[PDB]
Write a protein that holds these residues in place. Structure first.
Motif, PDB file in Angstrom:
ATOM      1  N   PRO A  98      55.461  11.307  33.558  1.00  0.00           N
ATOM      2  CA  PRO A  98      55.016  10.208  34.421  1.00  0.00           C
ATOM      3  C   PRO A  98      53.501  10.180  34.588  1.00  0.00           C
ATOM      4  O   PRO A  98      52.904   9.115  34.738  1.00  0.00           O
ATOM      5  N   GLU A  99      52.885  11.358  34.561  1.00  0.00           N
ATOM      6  CA  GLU A  99      51.438  11.466  34.710  1.00  0.00           C
ATOM      7  C   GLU A  99      50.722  10.955  33.463  1.00  0.00           C
ATOM      8  O   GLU A  99      49.575  10.513  33.529  1.00  0.00           O
ATOM      9  N   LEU A 100      51.409  11.018  32.327  1.00  0.00           N
ATOM     10  CA  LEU A 100      50.839  10.561  31.064  1.00  0.00           C
ATOM     11  C   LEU A 100      51.092   9.071  30.860  1.00  0.00           C
ATOM     12  O   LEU A 100      50.178   8.314  30.530  1.00  0.00           O
ATOM     13  N   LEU A 154      48.286   6.096  29.141  1.00  0.00           N
ATOM     14  CA  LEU A 154      48.383   5.146  28.038  1.00  0.00           C
ATOM     15  C   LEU A 154      48.138   3.720  28.523  1.00  0.00           C
ATOM     16  O   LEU A 154      47.272   3.018  28.002  1.00  0.00           O
ATOM     17  N   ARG A 155      48.906   3.303  29.525  1.00  0.00           N
ATOM     18  CA  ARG A 155      48.771   1.961  30.081  1.00  0.00           C
ATOM     19  C   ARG A 155      47.322   1.671  30.458  1.00  0.00           C
ATOM     20  O   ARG A 155      46.871   0.527  30.400  1.00  0.00           O
ATOM     21  N   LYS A 156      46.596   2.716  30.844  1.00  0.00           N
ATOM     22  CA  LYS A 156      45.197   2.576  31.231  1.00  0.00           C
ATOM     23  C   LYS A 156      44.292   2.561  30.002  1.00  0.00           C
ATOM     24  O   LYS A 156      43.380   1.741  29.901  1.00  0.00           O
ATOM     25  N   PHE A 157      44.553   3.472  29.071  1.00  0.00           N
ATOM     26  CA  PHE A 157      43.762   3.563  27.848  1.00  0.00           C
ATOM     27  C   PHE A 157      43.728   2.222  27.121  1.00  0.00           C
ATOM     28  O   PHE A 157      42.682   1.795  26.634  1.00  0.00           O
ATOM     29  N   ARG A 158      44.881   1.564  27.052  1.00  0.00           N
ATOM     30  CA  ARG A 158      44.985   0.273  26.384  1.00  0.00           C
ATOM     31  C   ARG A 158      44.181  -0.791  27.127  1.00  0.00           C
ATOM     32  O   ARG A 158      43.737  -1.775  26.534  1.00  0.00           O
ATOM     33  N   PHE A 159      43.997  -0.585  28.427  1.00  0.00           N
ATOM     34  CA  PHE A 159      43.249  -1.526  29.251  1.00  0.00           C
ATOM     35  C   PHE A 159      42.179  -0.805  30.067  1.00  0.00           C
ATOM     36  O   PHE A 159      41.964  -1.113  31.239  1.00  0.00           O
ATOM     37  N   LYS A 180      50.538  16.685  24.212  1.00  0.00           N
ATOM     38  CA  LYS A 180      51.431  17.725  23.713  1.00  0.00           C
ATOM     39  C   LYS A 180      52.777  17.673  24.426  1.00  0.00           C
ATOM     40  O   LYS A 180      52.980  16.869  25.335  1.00  0.00           O
ATOM     41  N   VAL A 181      53.697  18.537  24.007  1.00  0.00           N
ATOM     42  CA  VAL A 181      55.025  18.592  24.606  1.00  0.00           C
ATOM     43  C   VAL A 181      55.341  19.994  25.115  1.00  0.00           C
ATOM     44  O   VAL A 181      55.311  20.962  24.354  1.00  0.00           O
ATOM     45  N   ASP A 182      55.645  20.095  26.404  1.00  0.00           N
ATOM     46  CA  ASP A 182      55.968  21.380  27.014  1.00  0.00           C
ATOM     47  C   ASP A 182      57.428  21.746  26.767  1.00  0.00           C
ATOM     48  O   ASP A 182      58.338  21.017  27.163  1.00  0.00           O
ATOM     49  N   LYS A 183      57.644  22.880  26.109  1.00  0.00           N
ATOM     50  CA  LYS A 183      58.994  23.345  25.808  1.00  0.00           C
ATOM     51  C   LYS A 183      59.723  23.760  27.082  1.00  0.00           C
ATOM     52  O   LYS A 183      60.947  23.893  27.092  1.00  0.00           O
ATOM     53  N   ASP A 184      58.964  23.961  28.153  1.00  0.00           N
ATOM     54  CA  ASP A 184      59.539  24.359  29.433  1.00  0.00           C
ATOM     55  C   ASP A 184      60.138  23.156  30.157  1.00  0.00           C
ATOM     56  O   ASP A 184      61.194  23.258  30.782  1.00  0.00           O
ATOM     57  N   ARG A 185      59.457  22.018  30.067  1.00  0.00           N
ATOM     58  CA  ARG A 185      59.922  20.798  30.715  1.00  0.00           C
ATOM     59  C   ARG A 185      60.372  19.771  29.680  1.00  0.00           C
ATOM     60  O   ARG A 185      60.642  18.618  30.013  1.00  0.00           O
ATOM     61  N   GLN A 186      60.449  20.199  28.424  1.00  0.00           N
ATOM     62  CA  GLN A 186      60.866  19.316  27.340  1.00  0.00           C
ATOM     63  C   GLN A 186      60.389  17.888  27.589  1.00  0.00           C
ATOM     64  O   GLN A 186      61.162  16.938  27.477  1.00  0.00           O
ATOM     65  N   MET A 187      59.111  17.746  27.924  1.00  0.00           N
ATOM     66  CA  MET A 187      58.531  16.435  28.186  1.00  0.00           C
ATOM     67  C   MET A 187      57.110  16.349  27.640  1.00  0.00           C
ATOM     68  O   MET A 187      56.363  17.328  27.668  1.00  0.00           O
ATOM     69  N   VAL A 188      56.741  15.173  27.142  1.00  0.00           N
ATOM     70  CA  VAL A 188      55.409  14.960  26.589  1.00  0.00           C
ATOM     71  C   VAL A 188      54.372  14.813  27.697  1.00  0.00           C
ATOM     72  O   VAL A 188      54.435  13.883  28.502  1.00  0.00           O
ATOM     73  N   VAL A 189      53.416  15.736  27.731  1.00  0.00           N
ATOM     74  CA  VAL A 189      52.363  15.708  28.740  1.00  0.00           C
ATOM     75  C   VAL A 189      50.983  15.724  28.094  1.00  0.00           C
ATOM     76  O   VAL A 189      50.776  16.366  27.062  1.00  0.00           O
TER      77      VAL A 189
END
Length: 151
Positions: free
Chosen positions: A18-20, A24-29, A41-50
């Motif tokens: 959610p923090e990422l 993106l939405r900001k980078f594009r604008f 990157k992706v944390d194997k601990d939270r299996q989520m892209v951060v």
């Protein structure tokens, strides 16, 4: 695309932090007008892209240097293409940093979550670099111009 082998149809797809998502939405604008890159990157601990890092005012030659040599990760580079009549737009693309010296255990984590992370940033342009070296001012402007050369 024959060279290769496969078996089951399933990976360790990860979610879009959610923090990422916002990044993106900001980078594009964003309130900028130069070339910038975003390495996630992706944390194997939270299996989520951060988010992993964010560089601004950087050329397509520096980013390649910032990237690893054997570690899969996501990278969103924003180049600036000009026309002539006086119009210049920044064609944002998705640069997937996936070397040939990394492990198949990780590469998959990004190869399976890639679509997820990308779909989140809403990037209609996605490219895959077999190695940082590939990430060159040319190899980049080439994909934007009108498709690369062969293959």
């Amino acid at each position: 695309g024959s060279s290769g082998s496969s078996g089951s149809d399933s990976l360790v797809v990860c979610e879009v932090d959610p923090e990422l998502k916002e990044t993106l939405r900001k980078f594009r604008f964003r309130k900028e007008t130069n070339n910038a890159a975003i390495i996630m990157k992706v944390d194997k601990d939270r299996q989520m892209v951060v988010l992993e890092d964010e560089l601004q005012n950087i050329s397509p030659e520096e980013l390649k240097l910032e990237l690893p040599e054997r570690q899969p990760r996501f990278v969103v580079y924003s180049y600036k293409y000009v026309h002539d009549d006086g119009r210049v737009s920044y064609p944002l693309c998705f640069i997937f940093s996936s070397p040939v010296g990394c492990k198949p255990e990780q590469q998959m984590m990004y190869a399976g979550s890639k679509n997820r992370l990308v779909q989140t940033a809403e990037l209609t342009k996605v490219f895959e670099i077999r190695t940082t070296d590939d990430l060159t001012e040319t190899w980049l402007k080439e994909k934007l111009a009108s498709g690369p050369s062969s293959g």
